[PDB]
Amino acid sequence: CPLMVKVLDAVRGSPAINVAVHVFRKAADDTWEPFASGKTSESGELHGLTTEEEFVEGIYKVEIDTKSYWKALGISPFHEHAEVVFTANDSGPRRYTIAALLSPYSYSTTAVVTNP
Amino acid sequence: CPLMVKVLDAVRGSPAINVAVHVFRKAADDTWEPFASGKTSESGELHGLTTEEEFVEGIYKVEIDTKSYWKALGISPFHEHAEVVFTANDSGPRRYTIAALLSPYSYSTTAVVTNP
Amino acid sequence: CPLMVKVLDAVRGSPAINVAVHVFRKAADDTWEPFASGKTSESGELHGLTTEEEFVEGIYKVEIDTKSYWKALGISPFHEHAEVVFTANDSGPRRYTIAALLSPYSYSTTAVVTNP
Amino acid sequence: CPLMVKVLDAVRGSPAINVAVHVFRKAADDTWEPFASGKTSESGELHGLTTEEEFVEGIYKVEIDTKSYWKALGISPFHEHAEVVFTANDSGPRRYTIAALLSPYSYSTTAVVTNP
Ligand SMILES: Cc1ccc(C(=O)c2cc(O)c(O)c([N+](=O)[O-])c2)cc1
Ligand SMILES: Cc1ccc(C(=O)c2cc(O)c(O)c([N+](=O)[O-])c2)cc1
């Protein structure tokens, strides 16, 4: 439950379905190690990336392949991707929802962080 | 130049040009009194709505005709308009820029408030 | 299920809890008739406002009392409220989520509209 | 003036002043090559990063040091930075304005791309 990614389309007012998402964690030697990946479901959500026990303190990067999503709709968007980089679990375990709202020339992202 | 409105298009990545904007001030009977109006320029900006002397404290409404903008582009919009309601000049005269970033099914608005 | 309102706080990265929401529908004589109201729960969501059968075609207004939310946190925000006005069910019944992401001097809103 | 970056603060309702911004171009080996850098002015804008001749087609990254900005304000931020990655000049030279609207737990970015 501790990391969920949600992607919405601001053109159609819909979930953004089948969007690829890759998560990385920064290693002690400062490289980015692959951590998890998946694609958004029919609801625009990607669940099941990690576990409380695996999701230790660290700096995480979430890269959302927004360009492929728009190109499959015939659009050449501005951004190559949307990346979110954040320190997690620095004050103890938390649940993180990373949400992204997509348009061809803009995106917004927010974090909802809760303490279970 | 105490009040400026700027409108941007997140689909095209451009200013939102020729968008109609109406400004109201709340009357004592809580109805909306017409104040100023205009259309955005080629830069997406609308200047010259009021003066220092006329822009006194009060609650103001800015209505942006987003639906007409998207219809003119042949794109289906969700909202009937975008309205921004705010109390002006609470703590001395300010310069206000009201910016709106438009997508068909979402919009954002921010205020940039600087002290002359 | 057909109308849900969700409110998030972009300062704390959290649901916006206990936010008052009033919904209105435009009558045939062009006045706004109260339709439903409620406040957001612990998850930032407000469920149970209406039913498929009551939620007929029409122009609806959702007014979110963002100013009281910020004032209870000690903040004097820019906006008096966040209002969302939209035509619903014009092409047949749909489910609508109206989401608002709040900051003291900005807000975003999106609609997620699905066909059940 | 082909590239300008503008940063705004959604908490204060102001330009985000003195924000560090670094621009990179993707090298043939897929590493990021340093390109230009600066800090936002009192208007929240950063001008003068490049020239027409130097800003050739390529994939560019703009990294905005949002975490340092919020720490300087004494406000806890979520993100380590905000990055914008885009392919420039695909269809002839453009003027790009990259705007970012910052909150502690959310940010938005849009591109305003106009043709000289
Ligand atoms: C909510 C929101 C988000 C992004 C923009 C936005 O992209 C923008 C672009 C500009 O060139 C500009 O000059 C301003 N402004 O000063 O307010 C805003 C405008 C509104
Ligand atoms: C304008 C805007 C941008 C981002 C969010 C947003 O972060 C968000 C988060 C959720 O968990 C969620 O379920 C939804 N939703 O379905 O609408 C939106 C909400 C509003």
Author numbering:
A (entry chain B), B (entry chain A), C (entry chain B), D (entry chain A): 10 to 125
From the publication, what sentences describe this entry?
Transthyretin (TTR) is a homotetrameric protein produced mainly in the liver and in the brain's choroid plexus, and circulates in plasma and cerebrospinal fluid. TTR is composed of four identical 127 amino-acid residue β-sheet-rich subunits, termed A, B, C and D11. The TTR tetramer is formed by association of the AB and CD dimers. The weaker dimer–dimer interface defines two, largely unoccupied (<1% T4 bound), funnel-shaped T4-binding sites.
We obtained a co-crystal structure of tolcapone and WT-TTR at 1.15 Å. This high-resolution crystal allows the unambiguous placement of tolcapone in the butterfly-shaped electron density map of the TTR dimer–dimer interface. The twofold symmetry axis along the hormone-binding pocket creates two binding modes of tolcapone related by a 180° rotation. The 4-methylphenyl ring of tolcapone sits deep within the inner cavity of the T4-binding site, establishing hydrophobic interactions with residues composing the two symmetrical T4-Halogen-Binding Pockets HBP2–2′ and HBP3–3′ (Ala108, Leu110, Ser117 and Thr119). In addition, a specific hydrogen bond interaction is formed between the central carbonyl group of tolcapone and the hydroxyl side chain of Thr119 (at 2.55 Å). On the outer binding region, the 3,4-dihydroxy-5-nitrophenyl ring of tolcapone is placed in the hydrophobic environment created by residues from the HBP2 and -2′ and HBP1 and -1′ pockets (Lys15, Leu17, Thr106 and Ala108). The higher solvation interface between dimers in the TTR/tolcapone crystal structure with respect to the TTR/tafamidis structure suggests a lower water rearrangement, contributing thus to tolcapone's lower desolvation entropy for binding.
